Amino acid sequence: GRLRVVVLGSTGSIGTQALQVIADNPDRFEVVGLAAGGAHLDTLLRQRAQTGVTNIAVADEHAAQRVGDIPYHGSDAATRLVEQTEADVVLNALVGALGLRPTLAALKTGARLALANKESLVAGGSLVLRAARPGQIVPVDSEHSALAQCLRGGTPDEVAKLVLTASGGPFRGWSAADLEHVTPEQAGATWSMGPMNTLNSASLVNKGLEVIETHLLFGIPYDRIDVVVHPQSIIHSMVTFIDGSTIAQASPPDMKLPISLALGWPRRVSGAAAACDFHTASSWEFEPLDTDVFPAVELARQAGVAGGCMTAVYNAANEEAAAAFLAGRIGFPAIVGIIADVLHAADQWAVEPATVDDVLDAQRWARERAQRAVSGM
Amino acid sequence: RLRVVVLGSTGSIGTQALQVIADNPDRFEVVGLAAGGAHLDTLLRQRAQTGVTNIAVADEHAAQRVGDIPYHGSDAATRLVEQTEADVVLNALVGALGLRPTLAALKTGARLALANKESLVAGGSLVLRAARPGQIVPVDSEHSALAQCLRGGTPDEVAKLVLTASGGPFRGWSAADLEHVTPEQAGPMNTLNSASLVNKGLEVIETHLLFGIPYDRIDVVVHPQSIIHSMVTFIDGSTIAQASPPDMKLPISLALGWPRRVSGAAAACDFHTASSWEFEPLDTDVFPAVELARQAGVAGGCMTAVYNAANEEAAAAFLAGRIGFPAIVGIIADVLHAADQWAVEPATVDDVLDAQRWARERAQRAVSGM
Ligand SMILES: NC(=O)C1=CN([C@@H]2O[C@H](COP(=O)(O)OP(=O)(O)OC[C@H]3O[C@@H](n4cnc5c(N)ncnc54)[C@H](OP(=O)(O)O)[C@@H]3O)[C@@H](O)[C@H]2O)C=CC1
Ligand SMILES: O=[P-]([O-])[O-]
Ligand SMILES: O=[P-]([O-])[O-]
Ligand SMILES: [Mn+2]
Ligand SMILES: [Mn+2]
What we know:
Order of helices and strands of chain A: EHEHEHEHEHEHHEHEHHHEEEHEHHHH
Number of helices of chain A: 16
Distance between the termini of chain A: 59 Å
Strand order of the largest sheet of chain A: 4-3-2-1-5-6-7
Structural class of chain A: alpha/beta
Shape of chain A: globular
Oligomer: homodimer
Bound molecules: NADPH dihydro-nicotinamide-adenine-dinucleotide phosphate, phosphite ion, manganese (II) ion
């Protein structure tokens, strides 16, 4: 039947692709809510106009000043819209830890949560797990989407390993010597998924973050979650079972596919994306990740094994470190060095967070600690 | 603990199956062995190891040499099946001779772990009529892969099944080059059939019979590494694939243990070292055997038995130095072209035998004229 969808982060990259999917499938989906931050207010108003959804929220009260007929506005608007709207699916495509609370509200309503917001799991960790029930969270990320598909290839008891694929970033195969002179422009650093995104995939912190999320979503121990470099990005991830069989998910890159699947779970959406084409020659290459040169994934596994607020620390330390590198203050290899520095001092943050404020507090501590590492103070 | 009868126990599949069984006594027990009689040493050894005396030997003289074989003669494997209480029949015979033991296995209500693809291709709707849904679990890698990948969705979400083909030893060769191929370069039936691409054609038919999807939604792609064993493409554009280093113990173990996987059955893909999985279209003009299989499959009825039986005769002639390599598929085409009578649905096993008899003679006739 028709699923009722609240789209949080409607004006972002994931949120707009989801509305594409939804417009293309009015049989299967209906938008009943939209929420945005306020920075792209004009897009939200166009979206109100073109979908006819008046049930909309704007996080920034100051930006909400420009409109006058928003039923939900201010710091807790997305949360309140989630609380007050009857829905079957909440797509959380918000950016930053501000996505955490709307995630919790979504879980509490009993609606299915299509999760795009990284920090919900990476920072919110045990808060989100305590609040989620099985099958409630469906991941939007292509790796995690792939994993959920491949897991249909056996029972949980039959899983030997989860293998995430990684593009390798622009410095795939580079020596550590080469990495010493990397500049922001070489590493990426765009009108959409640009800024922080390209930097995390150049540094493989993005993979580290994905490894944590994989553990939290799927329950597989960190020592059985692998990463392989796969430059074409056709195989998005795979699962090795205990008999030696590997099941893999494959498609030409297009976020509309995992997005469509997150929305319609467990039923697939006819024509969401183009299939692989075996009418023409091609190849899928794999190479191991050099973990001496890129220890960002192993760092994440250490933070993840520590647990509690530690992955909040890991991510926050990264965000500060990358900023220092983007600002010319530090060298590229120093990004993961500062992250490790902060993690080594953070033993107090192994406790389980009780509240959102605990997560935010972990985050502030990591930033300050990383800031001191950058400045030598 | 599953009671398993192993037909063709001395062969490549059979010995590997016994090893898997040997390695999991908690799950599997051999209760029967069938063999041709060409490898008595291997057979005696398996008897001593498994302690099974419930044994079928096809060759009368061979069975005589061994002594105390309860089933001997041409129908011995079939009689062993009919009389042995079993949960699983592993049919790892080679050739369309596997047809009767396959039908017998199905009638006993046991699971048919099928390595002998020929019996299904020949039997067609006859074998299907005899089977319960899911009674036939494939041992063939492609089909074992497809079965796993189909867990990726419900049937109405399936867009396409994609079989992988190694391309054989003569992948990339021209028709002209193929004229010179010797039996040594195509080196048993498996090996030759992989080279001629007839094996892929049989697998395309097996795909339609096992999974019930139309021939125009079954694709073939050449993948020379043979790591990806087959894939399913769903209507949303997602493809689910199965992959493992080539080792028949994996699909054997799964066919035996279905729906449960057997830990340690085989080595997994190793991503601690670099590799490349390549794909290219099949050169169908140089290798038309897969297209000939589809034409046979779409005609249906006893036509697929004809396709296989023609090949068996032609392959024998090639291996004997009587014809050239390209003449294998040429003869199949010639025999198929004359096989108008055989589009009828087989109603008994005799219908299938009749079609095969005709096709064999017709293939000898074509060998005569060249
Ligand atoms: N890796 C592989 O080998 C693969 C095999 N397959 C399929 O599995 C099936 C078995 O192939 P494979 O194991 O390679 O073949 P083999 O030639 O290695 O084995 C054939 C077996 O059948 C026995 N046999 C038993 N009864 C008879 C009889 N009445 N007449 C003739 N032979 C008899 C032979 O015994 P004996 O030798 O003692 O006479 C032998 O054990 C084939 O249909 C093949 O297509 C499919 C995929 C991969
Ligand atoms: O590095 P990419 O796979 O996120
Ligand atoms: O060579 P095989 O894939 O038929
Ligand atoms: Mn990703
Ligand atoms: Mn095969």
